[PDB]
Design a protein around this ligand. Structure first.
Ligand SMILES: CC(=O)N1CCN(S(=O)(=O)C(C)C)C[C@@H]1C(=O)Nc1cc(-c2cnc(OC(C)C)c(C#N)c2)n(C(F)(F)F)n1
Lengths: 9, 242
């Protein structure tokens, strides 16, 4: 979830 | 191509310098700033859950820089998102543990923590004596080798790009990336006359043992204080470890 968002930032 | 290998070395070292969280010079310049006995006692008197919360916070912020390090590795962003997550979940804490050797002073066996250097007795309230001592021992081994900034860059890239992680979909692709990073690391050691450290690096499974201990101790702490973890641990920390 958070890693998903961090990788897309 | 030797040129392609050396371009990878430069790229990895640059990616690490941009994401190293703390410049090495800032850590070295603070080495004489050491916690007093009263400050050490204050840390020891803190509750277990408050020391765990603060330490989990510091680990979470350090992990965030490791994620940015991964994002600046060109081969890493070529992997599918499943494999990106697998590598980060398995290797991010290992990278942090390697990075900790820069914050460790082998001359007096202290580590930089919350603005000053302190011995391992500073962390007694955690109830993680074995984990903390093993981290100190691990950091002391890398410090004794004078692990350079470029060596840490290339080594932590290899820690992350590990084709043996269970759950990888494009295993062959990670294998190729790992081999190129191994060539880059070993080429840099050869060019800098540092190949003698190969036999002196910590064995395989030592880093995994540290990460397993961290998860095991967290499992115990979460069993003891489930609401503390739910209410006060950082969400990224829980996503990674619990
Ligand atoms: C803000 C701050 O103080 N900083 C951030 C910059 N790093 S840093 O650049 O090193 C960066 C790469 C961290 C140094 C330092 C730090 O955080 N040091 C630190 C953290 C821990 C630690 C604490 N709690 C742990 O587990 C508990 C949750 C049970 C574990 C483990 N496992 C490890 N230790 C150790 F000496 F005690 F290990 N020292």
């Amino acid at each position: 979830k958070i890693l998903h968002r961090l990788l897309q930032e | 191509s030797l040129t392609e290998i050396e371009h990878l070395v430069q790229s990895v070292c640059k990616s690490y310098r941009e994401t190293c969280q703390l410049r090495l010079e800032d850590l070295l310049r603070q080495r004489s700033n050491i916690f007093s006995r009263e400050e050490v006692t204050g840390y020891q008197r803190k509750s277990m859950w408050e020391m765990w919360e603060r330490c989990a916070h510091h680990l979470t912020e350090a992990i965030q820089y490791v994620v940015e390090f991964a994002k600046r590795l060109s081969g890493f962003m070529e992997l599918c998102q499943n494999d990106q997550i697998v590598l980060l979940k398995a290797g991010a804490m290992e990278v942090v543990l390697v990075r900790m050797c820069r914050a460790y002073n082998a001359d007096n066996r202290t580590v930089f923590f919350e603005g000053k250097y302190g011995g391992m007795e500073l962390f007694r309230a955690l109830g993680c004596s074995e984990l903390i001592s093993s981290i100190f021992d691990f950091s002391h081994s890398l410090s004794a080798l004078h692990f350079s900034e470029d060596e840490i860059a290339l080594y932590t890239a290899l820690v992350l790009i590990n084709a043996h992680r269970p759950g990888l979909q494009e295993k062959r692709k990670v294998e190729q990336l790992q081999y190129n990073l191994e060539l880059a690391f070993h080429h840099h050691l050869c060019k800098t006359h540092r190949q003698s450290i190969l036999a002196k690096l910590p064995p395989a499974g030592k880093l995994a043992s540290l990460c397993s201990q961290h998860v095991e101790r967290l499992q115990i702490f979460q069993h003891l204080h489930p609401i503390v973890v739910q209410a006060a641990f950082p969400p990224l920390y829980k996503e990674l470890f619990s």
